[PDB]
Structure 1
Amino acid sequence: MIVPVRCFSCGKVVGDKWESYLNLLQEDELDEGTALSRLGLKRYCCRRMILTHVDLIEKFLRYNPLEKR
């Protein structure tokens, strides 16, 4: 749903890396493997976490029962 905090296998913090990773692909126009490297994700353990994350939460958030649409 939202970025996981740690990599499942490494233990390495990964949750601070989602918003920047998107900005790398978007703004700096890098490919995925270059951007992952720039964020320090070396082990394929860790590259997998950010490479394949689906920010499904951003869908959930569009249904907010506490505001007049």
Structure 2
Amino acid sequence: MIIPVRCFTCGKIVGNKWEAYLGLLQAEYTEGDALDALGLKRYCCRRMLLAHVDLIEKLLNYAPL
């Protein structure tokens, strides 16, 4: 639904690195170099950001409002 705050395995704070990640995708950056620039060294946080699907806005499209 939404990006988890913490990485599941290690526990590094990953919730605050989501929208900026999207900015790097809004820029010309690839996935790997954007993850490197965000500072995700070990592959668990890279899996956290890379494999996350942002369903929150799609659900909000069905929100009452």
Q: TM-score range by the shorter chain?
A: over 0.9
Segments of 5+ residues of structure 1 without an aligned counterpart are none
The size of the alignment, in residue pairs, is 65
Q: Which has the larger radius of gyration?
A: 1
Matched, 1:13 2:13: yes
Moved over 2 A (4+): none
Please provide the CA RMSD for this pair: 0.8
Q: How does 1:50-65 map to 2 (within 5 A)?
A: 50-65=49-64
What TM-score results when the alignment is normalised by the length of structure 2?
A: 0.94
Task: Read off the aligned partner of 1:3 and give its amino acid letter.
Answer: I
Separation in 1 of the partners of 2:38 and 2:63?
Answer: 33
Task: Read off the aligned partner of 1:43 and give its amino acid letter.
Answer: R
More helix by share: 2
Aligned to 1:33: 32
Segments of 5+ residues of structure 2 without an aligned counterpart are none
Identity of aligned residues (%): 72
